[PDB]
Amino acid sequence: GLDNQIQEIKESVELPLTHPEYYEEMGIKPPKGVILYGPPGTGKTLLAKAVANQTSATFLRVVGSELIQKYLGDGPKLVRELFRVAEEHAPSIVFIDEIDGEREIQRTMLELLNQLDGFDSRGDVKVIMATNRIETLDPALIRPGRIDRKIEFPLPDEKTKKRIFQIHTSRMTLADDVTLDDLIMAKDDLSGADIKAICTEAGLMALRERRMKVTNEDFKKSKENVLYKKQEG
Amino acid sequence: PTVTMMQVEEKPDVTYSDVGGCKEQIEKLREVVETPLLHPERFVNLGIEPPKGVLLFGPPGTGKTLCARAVANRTDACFIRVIGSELVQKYVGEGARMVRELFEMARTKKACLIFFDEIDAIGGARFGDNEVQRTMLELINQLDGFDPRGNIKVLMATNRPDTLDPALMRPGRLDRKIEFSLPDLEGRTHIFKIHARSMSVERDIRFELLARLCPNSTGAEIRSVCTEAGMFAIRARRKIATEKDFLEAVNKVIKSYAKFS
Amino acid sequence: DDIYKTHLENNRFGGSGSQVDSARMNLASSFVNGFVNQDKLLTDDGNKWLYKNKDHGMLSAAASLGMILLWDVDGGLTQIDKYLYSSEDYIKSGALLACGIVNSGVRNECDPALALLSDYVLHNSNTMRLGSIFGLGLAYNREDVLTLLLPVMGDSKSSMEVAGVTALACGMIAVGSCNGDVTSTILQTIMEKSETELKDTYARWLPLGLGLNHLGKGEAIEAILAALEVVSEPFRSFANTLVDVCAYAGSGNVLKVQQLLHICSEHFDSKEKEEDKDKKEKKDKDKKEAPADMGAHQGVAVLGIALIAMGEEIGAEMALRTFGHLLRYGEPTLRRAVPLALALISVSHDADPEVSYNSIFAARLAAMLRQLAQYHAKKGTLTLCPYHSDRQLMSQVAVAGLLTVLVSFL
């Protein structure tokens, strides 16, 4: 169940310059964008909408907060770099992903909210924030940042990965006996590139033996990667 | 920083017609913010010092809209508001030179009106607090103290009346503490009367009908109603807004969002 | 089969034919509209759209119905006969041009076009000589039209495109001769080329007729023959290096590589442009040697040399990687020339460069060229020969009259 969500974010962030005649005539102008958050997250809606929105646009990749926490607290200097290159790339889409001591995270998040709010510029670029859990983020970010729309992902576990699995396996070839009860029952906090990654390493693992059929025990062996990926991080 | 020049609010905005049923309270606070502007010399001829300000607090409701009202109705020179978000910041102590430089700008802008929003940021110390004691005791020495002047406008807006010191220090200089009195069943139709200048409104819409089936729907939520009206009007390619079209947006935005809140 | 198994949309004909203005998007819309890539709505959109276009967009837009009719031999008669015997000159001259574009084996348009060409001074038969002689060259060692072009080669008319499409027409007719030829037409324009050395554009496109008449060589010494017979002041020495470009199709001739690096630092910055411009043909198979440090220099003309040396191949990531730094430049000649090779070498990184140029400009040159890129975003003789007519865009907008009739289309 994501058709209304993808036409609502399609109309939400594709109303600007890409087909713009329905945006600068009515006089609404919510030039703040949405903040992506998914209960599973981890590239499912982030990657799915990150590749689905690239039909005709300019993408800006910002993934992970490691470069801030792996060393001294440089802080908002790289935010100023991405803001001057986002200023030199104004008709783009600012996509910040994987937003994951606290005395400094609060001040670089306060300065991040201040510079991100558009305190020195009007609405010209669509800023998109992304995270795994929307509850870890302090509610003080919602009012300045989100004024346009926030999207929840009410996924049906069978028909989200069975519809995405069906569409994504209707053009390419695969193997038989592909079970789904352990998938919809066990998989959590993973993406569609992960079921595509285990079908690709499943059919590729069968390709190592030069076979086109995949055994159920081989699909559980590839499933173990999913079983440990959610337990590691 | 750039907030010191952001304190100026040009580009006029929402006018008097967003009064949320406070037909008398808007006089009980306009009497100090806008009345001493028409004839300031006549108050000096009266002998009494011009009034200082009032106190708005209680529920949020349609808060911060009355400052835009005070921007549009003041057609002479916009005023300066000080939100409490600039007080709770790292490396405290900047608010002293900040309030002295915005008071300096107040003396430079021929007695510019000064506003103070969100006192609850540093309010309620209940004595790490000494650095707050400096900013709030100096804040009393600069606001309740007659150092700048007993003059035109002093005001504190907040969501909690738990302020210990300002409540026992205001009666000397400040006065007229009144509740917010958010609009209920008689102000939302008038917020629709100021939203009449939005996207074309068909004369079939009854503001009372759209304003009576929405409990706890102050200017923010019905502002989102008038926002989703034009938004879904773009999503449906409609040329004129009619309540019978976006009624699903109304009962959706109040009911589907009032289920979990 | 292409109409059956594949289908094209109307976003580019209707879109790029609907946001037109400033009398130049009508030019680009007339050329892109002239392209076949089934739908013929923008052509049939009422009338007077050709009337609102310029004269070169009247040759291009009058030749649009011819360009969209590379097939349907019997349709070109009933489609072009409307533009025939019209009131405007470029409508009927571009109509005979379209008669030359529609087909290449019918050859029945010879007599009506050639019958009236004998005016030679200012009549409509001069533009009908452009479209009919160049278009007839596209429809073709044809010696009857060559003897008919002998007074045209000896016309010496100040109009550049007369001997432009005449030399390019006899050359494109004679591409592939056995070790070239020394015929009396290229020799005629060599002697008359020695008569008066004016209008250097003749010293740029007449050597194209020379070297295209010399096309087909594998070891011919005609470059040394002309290097002994037609050498003079730098202009005809630039003709000599044009014959050098048309004399090195490719063999084991490392002497051209040591001579290449030897003449890489010549004062004359145009023989480097052409002699180094031949890189796309000399080393066109060992693709590892083509990438060099030409962009790191300050001779922006060399950056244009590499830009031409990109080509029209599959367009790997290294190509567009060069089209990034070549795309970011201030001069309108290289910023206008980069979307041309960028569009020719490319056939979700197609509409994104268009938004990139939208980020560059937000002139009209890059607007027409960027709509040409809007269309073209998605050893052969005819598919590679007419590029040098496009390699002389650094001039007035009059190039659109000859750029619209390229035969490199598939």
Chain breaks in chain A (C to N over 2.5 A) after: 100
What dihedral angle (degrees, nearest 10) is formed by the CA atoms of A40, A42, A44, A46? 120
For tokens 């695969």, name the residue. Answer: A174
Q: Which of C171, C176, C186 is nearest to C138 (CA)?
A: C171
Q: Which of B97, B137, B121 is nearest to B4 (CA)?
A: B97
Q: Which of B104, B139, B141, B148 is nearest to B7 (CA)?
A: B104
CA-nearest residue of chain A to B234? Answer: A22
Q: Measured between alpha carbons, how far is C249 from C235 in angstroms, rounded to an integer? A: 23
- Name the percent of chain C in helix, strand, coil, to the closest 5: 55, 0, 45
> Which H or E run includes B9?
none
Task: Determine whether the annotation assigns residue A42 to a binding site.
Answer: yes
What dihedral angle (degrees, nearest 10) is formed by the CA atoms of C50, C51, C55, C58? 30
Helix/strand/coil for A128: strand
> Which H or E run includes B114?
strand B114-117
Task: Determine whether the annotation assigns residue B95 to a binding site.
Answer: no
For tokens 């967009």, name the residue. Answer: C57
**Greatest Cα-to-Cα distance within chain B, rounded to the nearest angstrom:** 62
Q: Do A56 and C359 touch (CB under 8 A)?
A: no
Angle CA A36–A37–A40, to nearest 5 = 135
First-residue to last-residue Cα distance in chain B: 37
Phi, psi of B80 (to 5 degrees): -115, 130
The amino acid at residue C112 is P
Helix/strand/coil for C69: coil
- DSSP code of residue C71: S
Q: Do A58 and C355 touch (CB under 8 A)?
A: yes
Can you give the C-alpha Rg of chain C in angstroms?
21
- Three-state SS across B26-38? HHHHHHHHCHHHH
Instruction: Note whether C406 and C34 are within 8 A (CB).
Output: no
Q: Do A89 and C359 touch (CB under 8 A)?
A: yes
Instruction: Note whether B199 and B20 are within 8 A (CB).
Output: no
> Which H or E run includes A94?
strand A93-97
> Tokens standing for B196?
């009449």
Q: Measured between alpha carbons, how far is C296 from A209 in angstroms, rounded to an integer? A: 49
Helix/strand/coil for B201: strand
Instruction: Report yes or no: A120 at the B interface, CB cutoff 8 Å.
Output: yes
> Tokens standing for C111?
């007599």
Q: Which of C295, C355, C352, C362 is nearest to C329 (CA)?
A: C295
- Name the percent of chain B in helix, strand, coil, to the closest 5: 45, 5, 45
Chains that touch A (3 or more CB pairs under 8 A): B, C
Q: Do B2 and A119 touch (CB under 8 A)?
A: yes
Residue C329 CB burial class (10 angstroms; 0-12, 13-18, ≥19): middle
Question: Which residues in chain B have their CB less than 8 angstroms from residue A11's CB?
Answer: 234-235
Q: Do A11 and B227 touch (CB under 8 A)?
A: no
For tokens 């496009």, name the residue. Answer: C390
> Which H or E run includes A111?
helix A102-116
Buried/exposed code over A25-36 (b: 16+ C-beta within 10 A; e: otherwise): eeebebbbbbbb
Experimental method: cryo-EM
Instruction: Note whether B52 and B151 are within 8 A (CB).
Output: yes
Q: Which of C31, C35, C88 is nearest to C60 (CA)?
A: C31
Task: Determine whether the annotation assigns residue B166 to a binding site.
Answer: no
For tokens 């916009």, name the residue. Answer: B78
For tokens 């499409």, name the residue. Answer: C165
CA-nearest residue of chain A to C15? Answer: A19
Q: Which residues contact B48 (CB under 8 A, 6 or more apart)?
A: none
Q: Measured between alpha carbons, how far is C234 from C207 in angstroms, rounded to an integer? A: 13
Q: Is the dihedral of CA A6, A9, A13, A17 positive or negative?
A: positive
CA-nearest residue of chain B to A120? Answer: B2
Q: Do A55 and C348 touch (CB under 8 A)?
A: yes
Phi, psi of B56 (to 5 degrees): -110, 130
Q: Hey, of A21, A26, A148, which one would you mutate to test binding to chain B, going by the most B CBs within 10 A of its CB? A: A26
Question: Which residues in chain A have their CB less than 8 angstroms from residue B199's CB?
Answer: 26-27
The amino acid at residue C13 is F
Q: Do A58 and C352 touch (CB under 8 A)?
A: yes
Region of C383 please: left (phi>0), alpha (psi -120 to 50) or beta: alpha
State the smallest CA–CA distance between residue A124 and chain C in angstroms. Answer: 13
> Tokens standing for C324?
């990034």
Residue B11 CA, distance from chain mean position: 17
Q: Measured between alpha carbons, how far is B162 from B169 in angstroms, rounded to an integer? A: 13
Q: Which residues contact C302 (CB under 8 A, 6 or more apart)?
A: C272, C276, C294, C295
Q: Measured between alpha carbons, how far is A52 from C105 in angstroms, rounded to an integer? A: 48
Residue A209 CA, distance from chain mean position: 35
What dihedral angle (degrees, nearest 10) is formed by the CA atoms of B10, B13, B15, B18? -140
Q: Which residues contact C366 (CB under 8 A, 6 or more apart)?
A: C332, C335, C336, C339, C357, C360
The DSSP annotation for C350-367 comes to SSHHHHHHHHHH--HHHH
Instruction: Note whether B30 and B104 are within 8 A (CB).
Output: no
Q: Which of C250, C247, C248, C294 is nearest to C273 (CA)?
A: C294
Q: Which of A155, A185, A183, A31 is nearest to A93 (CA)?
A: A31
Between chain A and chain B, the number of residue pairs with CB atoms below 8 A apart is 24
Give the one of B6, B90, B230 whose C-beta lies nearest to A28's C-beta: B230
Q: Which residues contact C404 (CB under 8 A, 6 or more apart)?
A: C30, C31, C34, C56, C59, C60, C63, C67
Neighbours of C196 (CB within 10 A): 9
Instruction: Note whether A119 and A84 are within 8 A (CB).
Output: no
Cα C213 to Cα A53, C251, C405: the distances in Å are 52, 20, 19
> Tokens standing for B227?
């926002």
Q: Measured between alpha carbons, how far is C43 from C3 in angstroms, rounded to an integer? A: 18
Task: Determine whether the annotation assigns residue A145 to a binding site.
Answer: no
- DSSP code of residue B253: I
Can you give the C-alpha Rg of chain A in angstroms?
20
Q: Do C359 and A55 touch (CB under 8 A)?
A: no
- Name the percent of chain A in helix, strand, coil, to the closest 5: 50, 10, 40
- Three-state SS across C178-195? CCCCCCHHHHHHHHHHHH
Can you give the C-alpha Rg of chain B in angstroms?
21
Helix/strand/coil for A62: strand
Residue C369 CB burial class (10 angstroms; 0-12, 13-18, ≥19): buried
Provide the edge-to-edge strand list for the sheet that holds B114-117: B80-82, B114-117, B156-157, B55-57, B177-179
Phi, psi of B121 (to 5 degrees): -70, -50
Question: Which residues in chain C have their CB less than 8 angstroms from residue A85's CB?
Answer: none
Cα C106 to Cα C36, C103, C133, C171: the distances in Å are 20, 6, 15, 20
Q: Measured between alpha carbons, how far is B222 from B257 in angstroms, rounded to an integer? A: 13
**Greatest Cα-to-Cα distance within chain C, rounded to the nearest angstrom:** 60
- DSSP code of residue C351: S
Residues in chain B: 261
Q: Do B230 and A27 touch (CB under 8 A)?
A: yes
Q: Measured between alpha carbons, how far is B10 from B26 in angstroms, rounded to an integer? A: 23
Give the one of A56, A57, A91 whose C-beta lies nearest to C359's C-beta: A91
Instruction: Note whether C312 and C335 are within 8 A (CB).
Output: no
Chain breaks in chain C (C to N over 2.5 A) after: 37, 140, 347, 362, 378
For tokens 């400040």, name the residue. Answer: B174
Q: Which residues contact A173 (CB under 8 A, 6 or more apart)?
A: A203, A212
What dihedral angle (degrees, nearest 10) is formed by the CA atoms of A166, A168, A174, A175? -30
Instruction: Note whether B240 and B200 are within 8 A (CB).
Output: yes
Instruction: Note whether C132 and C172 are within 8 A (CB).
Output: no
Instruction: Report yes or no: C356 at the A interface, CB cutoff 8 Å.
Output: yes
The β-bridge partners of A97 are: A63
Resolution given for this structure, in angstroms? 8.9
Q: Measured between alpha carbons, how far is C385 from C371 in angstroms, rounded to an integer? A: 23
- Three-state SS across B136-179? HHHHHHHHCCCCCCCCCCCCEECCCCCCHHHHHHHHHHCCCEEE
Task: Determine whether the annotation assigns residue B64 to a binding site.
Answer: yes
Q: Measured between alpha carbons, how far is A20 from B81 in angstroms, rounded to an integer? A: 36
- DSSP code of residue B50: P
Q: Measured between alpha carbons, how far is A75 from A82 in angstroms, rounded to an integer? A: 12
Q: Which of A25, A54, B140 is nearest to C348 (CA)?
A: A54
Q: Which residues contact B118 (CB under 8 A, 6 or more apart)?
A: B83, B84, B85, B87, B157, B158
Give the one of A26, A107, A120 whose C-beta lies nearest to B230's C-beta: A26
For tokens 């905005």, name the residue. Answer: B13
Instruction: Report yes or no: A15 at the B interface, CB cutoff 8 Å.
Output: yes
Q: Do A91 and C352 touch (CB under 8 A)?
A: no
- DSSP code of residue B8: B
Neighbours of B208 (CB within 10 A): 12
Neighbours of C157 (CB within 10 A): 15
Q: Measured between alpha carbons, how far is C346 from B44 in angstroms, rounded to an integer? A: 80
Q: Measured between alpha carbons, how far is B245 from B240 in angstroms, rounded to an integer? A: 10
Residue A211 CA, distance from chain mean position: 34
Residue B181 CB burial class (10 angstroms; 0-12, 13-18, ≥19): middle
Q: Within the 359-388 window of chain C, which residues sit less than 8 Å (CB to CB) from chain A?
A: 359
Q: Do A28 and B90 touch (CB under 8 A)?
A: no
For tokens 């190592």, name the residue. Answer: A208
